[PDB]
DNA sequence: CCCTGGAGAATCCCGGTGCCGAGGCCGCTCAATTGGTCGTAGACAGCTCTAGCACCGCTTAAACGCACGTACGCGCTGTCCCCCGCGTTTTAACCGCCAAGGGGATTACTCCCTAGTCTCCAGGCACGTGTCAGATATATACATCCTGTGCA
DNA sequence: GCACAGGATGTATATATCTGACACGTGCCTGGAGACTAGGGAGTAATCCCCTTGGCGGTTAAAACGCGGGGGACAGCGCGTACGTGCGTTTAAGCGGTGCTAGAGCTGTCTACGACCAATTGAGCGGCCTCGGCACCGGGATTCTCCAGGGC
């Protein structure tokens, strides 16, 4: 038993079952999806860090994340992502 | 009840100015259809840069666009500019 | 105990009492080594007094030193003609034209040093500052001295940079907005006397301080004519569209950056805004007057005055408002004459001459408030309508006196249109404060 | 006592790990502090992008009469969508191939 | 009878002159009006600084100069001397824009 | 004897290889080349198989994109044959 | 070792060009393509070897290759 | 007692602020710990790069017969040198102009 | 009294006098030099942070700085910079 | 000078094999809970300098419209050789299998290098201030195009 | 049809002037250096075993070589067309002002709420096994395409 490796595989599988209820994925495709998730996380987090440094803050917030997704995602993807993220933050605020 | 429009602002980038840019680029002969194409390309480039700059300005909770915002937008686009901070 | 009569060097005319006493005051100023401001209203021979002073300083005192006169471009030909007419003995040269003419002039006439008086303009002074720096000027005369009233201005900085032994400010209205302008003028005059930034504690102390530096004579020494002006303020109410746009602008797609500048024209006419006018057909029929209270009152008043004495001058601060007025007059089939900043110089003279013909069909003359070059002799008018009011009361005073000239024979009515419960009330209050300050300081 | 533990992902109705995202933000030297809404927002954005790509890839795999998504399907889905193509312009997908495309000059006349 | 240079010597003189200088080749006021018009579509009630428009003009001129260099290279590749929208589009397509 | 015209087989190969997804270079020669190039920077280097596979994938993608741009240059020159001049123009415009 | 770039053969270059979408190929294309491949591989392998030496390993890993490709602007999905 | 203060730049033989580099590294959110020699190494590298660029720009200025360096001289120095051209390929210098260059086919013949 | 703005102008001036004693520099060229120094600093620091994260460490050392220099600089510049940095580190550790 | 008529390639349709994806079970470590605290950011107040909006005056360089002539882009044709499709022989890649050992990966231990704190002081930054380098003008000297004209 | 002379244009070169920005000097204050203590990160040693390398034999697909021919590349030619060059007219850019107000940056304070930190824990998630269904391989019959020959 070697060290433990983290991956987004189970969450990607949950999303896949939600989207296409009776479709599967292969190991190579799952590795590609994990790489994509890591790359997008890195881009958004780095842009948010740059914004925080530019404005001379010390905290990464939902406003920084929203500005980062506006900067990085193109057009309609940015609009839909902003809507979904705002929805999630609103539900988390109400339910907590 | 009086009105008078002047011109499109994209026409302010004139044919002699485009010719001067082509001369600095090293062009000898220029076709007559080049000018509209150059105006479109310039418009697209400016649209991208200004959208990023306005996003930065809105995040900063300001209504004034700064050279810093322009520099950060250009760095996002991959066109680092020296000489303005 | 000074020169009690017209001098000897002045030919073609005998100087009258006010100009001879002004010349005595200038001579005493030079003798006491003090520089002063000559504010003899607008048209009682300030140019003639300056010319007589220069002639005196050249002839009765053998000092042929160089002299410079700064004038607006519009007055250059008049100044040169007067110099040739009244005191032909002195040699006066002018610097005008493009680069070739300027260089030819400086190489041919200026540098050799045969000239005695130089009559240049503001722009030519800014262009040739380096050339003008070399000479050791004796007398520096600045016509329309309110041009340098703002420090940090390039003209004021350049003129202070010069090297001179005597100075003389020539203005009509020394105080316009605030005492900082007067301090700037007095700092140019005597930098040593006035160097700091700034009814016994005031008023009287100001009068006694400024008395040895100023000489003013209101247009009452001669009179015998010029019936007094009657000013009436007409209060108007916003139309429905004006009210809606006013509320929408106050609460908040067109940009509204200068909110005061949007409230202004909103008081003037909602048609100035994009989309407020009705649809694309773009007709001109009766929805122009009914959408503005000022338009309603004006449409009631103009036919009345035309049945009456007519010959009405309309002064406005907006060329867009002038366009709307032109459309209204064309609809009503009046005769409208327009004078604007964009009107070419030849058209201005033709328009004023046509409006001033002994018998002409012209009824409405439309002018921008500050576009006049302080000339414009419209002495045939009867009614002056200030459609919009300016912050500076002296601008409105000049607009009024363009119809209150010497040739006027009938009393003039000044109709000032003010909207109730708007920013125009604040504008009028500010103008009243400035006018009261100017009166209490200079007029007394 | 202690209440029953509820995951923040369940509180936000997401299928992505909010706590894991928060820990990754804290361990990544991005800023001194991290807010409460930032992990939720980032997880939601990641979930939306994953859903979009998976939907397009599943449709492509359906057109190929397959039940499993492979890198070829992923590449087809990415390159046939303008937004995802602009987002992943500088990315090479292993065993993804190229789009079928022949210039009209090379076709027999 | 009047003196006239051949069609292309004045062009080479202009090339040398404008490759020797460093100034801006676009009129400031028209460029500023264009920038404000473009910013209108993204946010009304927007104000600009003088440095922002200067930086935008510099970046735009540099981009256009580089594009024209690539366009000239493509035109020379096509055994031509006159640059064309075909050359501009090919340059943009290869650069990935 | 049946003989296809000069260009039909090329189009068939184009369609076949654009449909396919496998590697187009021989793995042992590529590995030998990679090891030879690696001898310049360090001695007695060892490689994982996945490393060589990833290098080969990157090389395939880079060459395919370069060939697409070269074909576009050749079409611009009103030709159907691609040339080293076309390759050089593509590299120069790309920025290499 | 030596004489290994010639291991990248003319049929392989033709297959790559066919996947790129070209019909006719000049005879001088192959050496040019070999040179381009050499320069690209040299850059990538140099960066990967720098990563490996910093890690103080004798083995070059797929993660090192991926990091080199990412820092060259050629992100590769499917290896970590 | 208390020995006299000596800057780390002076002790390293550099003309660059080693202490300011250390402070910027600790405030830049790059890592939670910063070694002692890393600011020294970084300051030395920055000094070498600045010296190279300034020497080339001064040579260009002396070629133009001027004693003050201008952005045009900086651009001429950055170009014409393969190392600095590659290092600053995606960088625009304000009012730096372009290199004199005319293609051979355009020359008269 | 306006706020304090930090810049590298003093040190750039020192290096300019060291390498070309009778030479000046304008204000805009100073801005360009300051921007160049900031950009290079940010590049090297980001690369070093990425190296530390890759190797699962938390300290940025001279090894990280040297590796980042080798990754970012092209060849001769890289090796000369390595020599300069090694000289500086050796002199710093010699008696201080 | 397109319409049949053969060949060759691709495609659909069945049937048998294998191996990998999806599920299920165990165990641990990492996120959730609760409590306490502090310090960062929001909020407020005052000052000062810039930007926007509607105007005016003036100067003058630059854009614009126009006409003429000339390189040049573009179509067209011919020639030739070069690349391509096909068949044959050689070659080494590929795959399965075995064997040995180097080095990656993990763990335990300890020390030493960095973070954090408190003093102290001096190096860098804002502010004045003078003067010299560079821009600009003006007048020659020289290098470049262009054309006409004489001549073999 | 060529080669050269001269004219005209532009460009480079010297010199004189002037100005405003660069370079220097001063005060002071804020950040860097000096000395010290605690604590955790990383260096070092040792062990395990995975993975990498080396070697071999047999298939067979793929590469190399040669051949015969048609299609593409390239050089040459001719034309009529769109662009360059110069000139006279018009426009608007650029500079200098008025008159006012809000935005933004800074400095300085207050204060409170949200994020960090620590101890406990239990459920989520990763690793290992296992099995059955989809993907793959092979084989047969179809449909489509491309090329040639000629009666269209
Ligand atoms: N010969 C004269 N001398 C003095 N004043 C005169 C003379 N002729 C006319 N005026 C007055 O001068 C006024 C306009 O002259 P203006 O240009 O104002 O002169 P100034 O600038 O010297 O006051 C007229 O109203 C007229 O009454």
Residue numbers in the entry:
A (entry chain D), I (entry chain H): 27 to 122
B (entry chain B): 17 to 101
C (entry chain W): 166 to 363, 377 to 430, 443 to 634
D (entry chain C), H (entry chain G): 10 to 118
E (entry chain A): 37 to 133
F (entry chain E): 38 to 133
G (entry chain F): 22 to 101
The authors write:
All known remodeler enzymes use an Snf2-type ATPase motor to slide nucleosomal DNA around the histone octamer, but the precise underlying mechanism is unclear. Here, we use cryo-electron microscopy (cryo-EM) to visualize the continuous motion of nucleosomal DNA induced by human chromatin remodeler SNF2H, an ISWI family member. We merged the datasets from all conditions and performed extensive data analyses to determine 13 unique structures of the active SNF2H bound to the nucleosome. Based on the conformations of DNA at SHL2 and of SNF2H, we clustered our 13 structures into five groups (A to E).
In group B (tracking strand movement, 45% of A-D particles), the DNA tracking strand is pulled out more than the guide strand, deforming DNA locally at SHL2 and SHL3. SNF2H adopts a canonical open conformation, identical to that of ADP-bound ISWI and with similar density for the bound nucleotide,7,8 indicating that group B structures represent post-ATP hydrolysis states. However, the position of SNF2H relative to the nucleosome is different from the ADP-bound structures. The other group B structures show gradual conformational transitions in SNF2H: relative to the B1 structure, SNF2H moves further outward in the B2–B4 structures, with the brace helix moving away from the nucleosome. The lobe 2 movements pull the nucleosomal DNA away from the histone octamer surface at SHL2 and SHL3, with both guide and tracking DNA strands displaced outward but to different extents: the tracking strand is pulled out by ~6 Å in group B structures, while the guide DNA strand is pulled out by ~1–2 Å in B1 and ~3–4 Å in B4 structure, concomitantly with the gradual outward movement of the brace helix. At SHL2 and SHL3, only the tracking strand is pulled by one nucleotide, whereas sliding of the guide strand is blocked by the brace helix. The dissimilarity in the tracking and guide strand movements results in DNA backbone deformation and base tilting at SHL2 and SHL3, which is necessary to accommodate the 1-nt difference between guide and tracking strands. The observed DNA distortion and formation of short A-DNA helix at SHL2 in group B are similar to features seen in the nucleosome bound to chromatin remodeler Chd1 in a nucleotide-free state.
